[PDB]
Design a binder for this molecule. Structure first.
Ligand SMILES: CC1=N/C(=C\c2cc(F)c(O)c(F)c2)C(=O)N1C
Length: 109
């Protein structure tokens, strides 16, 4: 998977959520196997809430992975979504939180 092959390391993450907030931060990827990478998440939401999270991305196809994250700094809510390749330096994030809220964003280098 080319997508999985590009992901190792640090990406700048920006998101918007359903409540009209934005977040800025990073996702750090660590490959674990040919199909899997671990994630650690750090950032801030526009209302001041700090983001501390972690999770795992699993290869689905050449350009798509499914990722589950959990966020101890956000009352342990979770997020499940797809990481899709856009370019060697950009991925897109489309997910739903465990509160049923839509949460999308981008990964950039
Ligand atoms: C920037 C950023 N926002 C993240 C998560 C996140 C952002 C939000 F705005 C949420 O409402 C929420 F539930 C999770 C994340 O992991 N990073 C790195």
């Amino acid at each position: 998977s080319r997508a999985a092959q590009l992901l190792p390391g640090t990406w700048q993450v920006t998101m918007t959520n359903e409540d009209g907030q934005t977040s800025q931060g990073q996702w750090h990827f660590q490959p674990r196997s040919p199909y899997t990478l671990d994630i650690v998440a750090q950032g801030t939401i526009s209302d001041g809430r700090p983001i501390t999270g972690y999770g795992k991305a699993t290869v689905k196809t050449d350009d798509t992975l499914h990722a589950n994250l959990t966020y101890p700094s956000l009352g342990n809510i979770k997020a499940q979504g797809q990481i899709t390749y856009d370019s060697p330096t950009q991925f897109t994030w489309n997910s739903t939180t465990s509160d049923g809220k839509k949460l999308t964003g981008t990964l950039q280098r």
